[PDB]
């Protein structure tokens, strides 16, 4: 019954001509619900889940103001950081920002986040206590001193513990039918001979939500990692996720092997065995 809200911003400079490309996305758990793309025609924050479309024009006006202003802030910051790092004006660079909050099943604040990167490495991040910053290098130390003087952590903390938690709660009751549902994995095993003496067993998990899942093989009841392969969890494109795990076994010995599936939507883990 725990939940999260996150925003992800990406700004990429383009020195051949014009302003940086800015993309913002918002998520509740593993469900995207809004986007902004500075190269799109609308120039508005846009809905990406049916349940947010009910929000009124004032909602969209305020969210659009914020992300358009953020795109300008990032533009300025790309310039400032180029200077801090003594980089040329000719190259493209990237700023990334993530922030958001986690709540417990009671809907109360658990944890807040705010972290920033430059060219795919840590730049500055708010600590878990929401009261202090971690600056990765002497460039980020400059930013840290400025942010301390501006009481930026206090401002971030008030949002993370206040508005973030309150709007996450509102969305969870607005999109309840999907956001508060768990879809357990649809599981099955396949069998593929490799040679006269070996075969692959593959354990499939399909259609599950949220994305967190664990697949594990055992042989005669003991965990087995030798001769196994696993794919990264992947989106199906319809709001659900997929994963598989495989093991190579001597042919005839298939019944020794079991696949064990853990997911939030399963009251007890599932066990599968080739018959």
């Amino acid at each position: 019954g725990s939940h999260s809200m996150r925003y992800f911003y990406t700004s990429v400079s383009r020195p051949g001509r014009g302003e940086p490309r800015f993309i913002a996305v918002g998520y509740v758990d593993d469900t995207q619900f809004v986007r902004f793309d500075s190269d799109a025609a609308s120039q508005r924050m846009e809905p990406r889940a049916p349940w947010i479309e009910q929000e009124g024009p004032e909602y969209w006006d305020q969210e659009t103001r914020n992300v358009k202003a953020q795109s300008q802030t990032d533009r300025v910051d790309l310039g400032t950081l180029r200077g801090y790092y003594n980089q040329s004006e000719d190259g493209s660079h990237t700023i990334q920002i993530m922030y958001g909050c986690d709540v417990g099943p009671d809907g109360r604040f658990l944890r807040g986040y705010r972290q920033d990167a430059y060219d795919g490495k840590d730049y500055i991040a708010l600590n878990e206590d929401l009261r202090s910053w971690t600056a990765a290098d002497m460039a980020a130390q400059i930013t840290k001193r400025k942010w301390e003087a501006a009481h930026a952590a206090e401002q971030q903390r008030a949002y993370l513990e206040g508005r973030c938690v309150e709007w996450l709660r509102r969305y969870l009751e607005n999109g309840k039918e999907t956001l508060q549902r768990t879809d357990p994995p649809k599981t099955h095993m396949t069998h593929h001979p490799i040679s006269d003496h070996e075969a692959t067993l593959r354990c499939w998990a399909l259609g599950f939500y949220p994305a967190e899942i664990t697949l594990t093989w055992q042989r005669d009841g003991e965990d087995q990692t030798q001769d196994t392969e696993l794919v990264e969890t992947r989106p199906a494109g319809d709001g659900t996720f997929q994963k598989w795990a495989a093991v190579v076994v001597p042919s005839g010995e298939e019944q020794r092997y079991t696949c064990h599936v853990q997911h939030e939507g399963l009251p007890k883990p599932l066990t599968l065995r080739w018959e």
Binding site: Y7, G26, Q62, V67, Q70, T73, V76, T143, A152, W167
Partner: peptide, 9 residues
Amino acid sequence: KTFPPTEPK
């Protein structure tokens, strides 16, 4: 809902 832009870097 988003947080407004924070202080420049």
